[PDB]
Design an enzyme around this catalytic site. Structure first.
Site, PDB file in Angstrom:
ATOM      1  N   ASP A 256      -5.690   6.591  -6.646  1.00 34.57           N
ATOM      2  CA  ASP A 256      -5.210   5.208  -6.620  1.00 34.57           C
ATOM      3  C   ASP A 256      -5.340   4.509  -7.976  1.00 34.57           C
ATOM      4  O   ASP A 256      -5.451   5.167  -9.015  1.00 34.57           O
ATOM      5  CB  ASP A 256      -5.856   4.387  -5.485  1.00 34.57           C
ATOM      6  CG  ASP A 256      -7.364   4.225  -5.637  1.00 34.57           C
ATOM      7  OD1 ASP A 256      -7.925   4.647  -6.669  1.00 34.57           O
ATOM      8  OD2 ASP A 256      -7.992   3.671  -4.709  1.00 34.57           O
TER       9      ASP A 256
ATOM     10  N   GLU B  24       0.805  -1.208   0.000  1.00 35.46           N
ATOM     11  CA  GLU B  24       0.000   0.000   0.000  1.00 35.46           C
ATOM     12  C   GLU B  24       0.847   1.272   0.000  1.00 35.46           C
ATOM     13  O   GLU B  24       0.372   2.343  -0.383  1.00 35.46           O
ATOM     14  CB  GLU B  24      -0.944  -0.033   1.200  1.00 35.46           C
ATOM     15  CG  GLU B  24      -2.312   0.561   0.947  1.00 35.46           C
ATOM     16  CD  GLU B  24      -3.078  -0.100  -0.185  1.00 35.46           C
ATOM     17  OE1 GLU B  24      -2.916   0.324  -1.351  1.00 35.46           O
ATOM     18  OE2 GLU B  24      -3.862  -1.029   0.098  1.00 35.46           O
TER      19      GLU B  24
END
Lengths: 454, 6
Positions: A232, A223
């Site tokens: 993202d 992450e």
């Protein structure tokens, strides 16, 4: 004339000599280098002091015991070349230093036990300098416990006549009734109690570490960390350790949803972490409130236990419970066939890399996927904790057994075969005892390096 | 007849 000779061949003596010398270069270099490397700088400081004491002990074993014994005990067995003071002094020093290395290894296993198993309870609060006084007391106990060796050992004329100069040996001079007492005590204090402590403690460590979910160090890879708002994979608004917030377009409610202070799009490090803690917490809580995902979570171990949390973190309890049959197999330990299921159009191969990484973790139950970075901290903790017990017991067990039979195998199975076997055995046992003081520098730098957990 | 070295 003087038939107290030992017939061990020149070739085995050359062998053992070689081995002792290798052991010597390794042990001396390692111990010296460690003790002068940590002559420069809580609470890991305490383990440093313990290490320092250890290396000092081992160094002194190598310097004092090795050379003389290599000469008188493996090459020229008789007569004793260093006089009475030589004899008693040697044996006292031997004893003192071995008590030292034993008590130290134990105390270090105890300190590490405390730090890892009772971090707040023991480590941060109770454990603090001066534990210098503890090391002091250890050395004192080594000296006092070694005191008997000054009375028990001695010089004795054992030549056939008992008058010839070449039969003067160093041997226990007191009644054999007491010799048993002395060396039994030494056996217990220098091996049994310590070895039990090392054993159970490190075992408990190992199990505690194997049972700990490496979930955080796992997500920090996948992450990442960005403390300024971004987009993202599927183009939503994210900050911190991949924390999605206000996924709706665009850049405004994203900045509003920055709670908790007016972020103005940017956050601090401690805030990105505290955020990350909440997210991981809400994931597990999501796991344990969900009827499909809970019993699967329960049966899993710690690695595939983290592997799930990863998925729940990435997609919520709702999505992960949408993998019905994969769950059914994971619960049934069908690592093989369940991996193939997940790899199917799972639609979560919209991010295949992160998926490939999670499935080969689920499948193998190991951290091979996450590179050679210290996500392996826990596993190495385990292996090191195994190494400690194996090393100590292997190295010192036969040594104490050989000493017991000096006074117990006594009467009257003392044949030529046994007399010989005894001395080849001696070669072996001191080889292992000296292997301790050369294996434990290198090993214990690895446990010193292995405190990224705390 | 036994060892003399401990």
């Amino acid at each position: 004339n003087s038939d107290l000779d030992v017939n061990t061949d020149i070739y085995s003596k050359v062998l053992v000599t070689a081995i002792y010398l290798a052991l010597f270069v390794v042990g001396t270099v390692g111990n010296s280098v460690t003790l002068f490397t940590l002559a420069r700088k809580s609470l890991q400081s305490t383990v440093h002091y313990h290490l320092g004491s250890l290396a000092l002990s081992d160094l002194l074993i190598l310097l004092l015991a090795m050379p003389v014994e290599l000469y008188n005990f493996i090459w020229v067995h008789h007569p004793w070349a260093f006089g009475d003071a030589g004899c008693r002094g040697y044996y006292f020093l031997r004893d003192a230093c071995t008590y030292a290395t034993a008590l130290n290894v134990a105390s270090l296993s105890v300190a590490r036990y405390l730090a890892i198993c009772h971090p707040f309870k023991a480590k941060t609060l109770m454990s603090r300098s001066r534990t210098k006084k503890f090391i002091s007391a250890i050395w004192l106990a080594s000296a006092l416990l070694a005191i008997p060796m000054l009375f028990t050992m001695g010089l004795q004329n054992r030549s056939a006549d008992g008058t010839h100069p070449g039969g003067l040996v160093c041997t226990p001079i007191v009644d054999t009734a007491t010799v048993k007492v002395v060396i039994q005590v030494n056996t217990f204090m220098s091996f049994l109690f310590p070895m039990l402590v090392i054993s159970i403690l490190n075992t408990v460590i190992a199990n505690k570490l194997t049972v700990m979910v490496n979930i955080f160090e796992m997500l920090r890879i996948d992450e990442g960390l960005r403390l300024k708002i971004y987009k993202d994979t599927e183009g939503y608004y994210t900050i911190g350790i991949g924390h999605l917030l206000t996924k709706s377009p665009s850049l405004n409610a994203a900045k509003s949803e920055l709670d908790k202070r007016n972020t103005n799009g940017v956050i601090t490090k401690d805030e990105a972490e505290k955020l990350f803690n909440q997210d991981v917490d809400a994931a597990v809580r999501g796991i344990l409130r969900n009827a499909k995902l809970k019993p699967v979570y329960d049966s899993l171990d710690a690695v595939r236990r983290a592997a799930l949390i990863n998925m729940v973190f990435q997609m919520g309890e709702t999505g992960v419970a949408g993998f019905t049959n994969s769950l059914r197999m994971l619960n049934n330990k069908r690592w093989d066939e369940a991996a193939v299921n997940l790899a199917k159009s799972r639609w979560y191969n919209q991010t295949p890399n992160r998926a490939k990484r999670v499935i080969t973790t689920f499948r193998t139950g190991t951290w091979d996927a996450y590179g050679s970075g210290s996500v392996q901290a826990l596993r190495h903790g385990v292996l090191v904790a195994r190494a400690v017990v194996i090393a100590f017991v292997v190295c010192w067990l036969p040594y104490h057994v050989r000493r017991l039979m000096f006074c117990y195998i006594s009467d009257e199975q003392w044949t030529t075969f046994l007399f010989d076997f005894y001395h080849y055995f001696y070669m072996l046992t001191n080889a292992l005892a000296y292997a301790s003081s050369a294996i434990n520098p290198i090993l214990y730098n690895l446990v010193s390096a292995n405190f990224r957990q705390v | 007849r036994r060892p003399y070295i401990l």
